[PDB]
Amino acid sequence: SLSAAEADLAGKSWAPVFANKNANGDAFLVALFEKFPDSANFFADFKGKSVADIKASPKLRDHSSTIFTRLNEFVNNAANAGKMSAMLSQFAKEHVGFGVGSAQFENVRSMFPGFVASVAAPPAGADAAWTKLFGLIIDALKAAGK
Ligand code: HEM
């Protein structure tokens, strides 16, 4: 889990992103697919399509809102080590179930702070909080197999 200070920083930098949830979730998933294009092959709905077809698919919103809803839950429970511990091992089992491993979350981790900051300049220290949150997810995936 994150410390109280990291959780607070993550929460503050996430609020303006989540306030325009639908559009920012779509733009997140599109940014992830543009510059890690094999990410799209893990999704049955997107496998084989170019990013232009994904941008126009109505399934974009389904997957992006699901991601932002559960990311929101992680952010607001981040400093609760027992809740975090159970959420992470949910999350890891579900993703290993779809063939997703830690390498894919290393990719998310590398772009996430820059995505958040392009919606709104975050307080100082917010990237390291986000980096640590994804490192917990990456660890849980490794612990669950890959
Ligand atoms: C960015 C952080 C992410 C969060 C918070 C997240 C969250 C979720 C959630 C809540 C689900 C639905 C689970 C269920 O219904 O059982 C899901 C499904 C899925 N996720 Fe993730 N996800 C993230 C990143 C990724 C990444 C990076 C990949 C692969 C590159 C991925 C691949 C998938 C796939 C393939 C599914 C199943 C889609 C379907 O067929 O409905 N997710 N994700």
UniProtKB/Swiss-Prot annotation:
Limits of the Globin domain: 1-146
Matching InterPro entries: Erythrocruorin, Globin, Globin-like_sf, Globin/Proto, Globin_lamprey/hagfish, Mb-like_M
Highest rank taxon of the organism: Eukaryota
Cellular component terms per the entry's GO annotation: extracellular region; hemoglobin complex
Keywords for the protein's UniProt record, in alphabetical order: Acetylation, Heme, Iron, Metal-binding, Muscle protein, Oxygen transport, Transport
Positions of modified residues (N-acetylserine): S1
GO molecular-function term, one example from the UniProt record: heme binding
Binding site for heme b: H95
Family designation: Belongs to the globin family.
Note in the entry: This molluscan globin lacks one of the heme-binding histidine residues found in most other globins.
Assembly description: Monomer.
Protein name: Globin
Upper lineage: Eukaryota, Metazoa, Spiralia, Lophotrochozoa, Mollusca
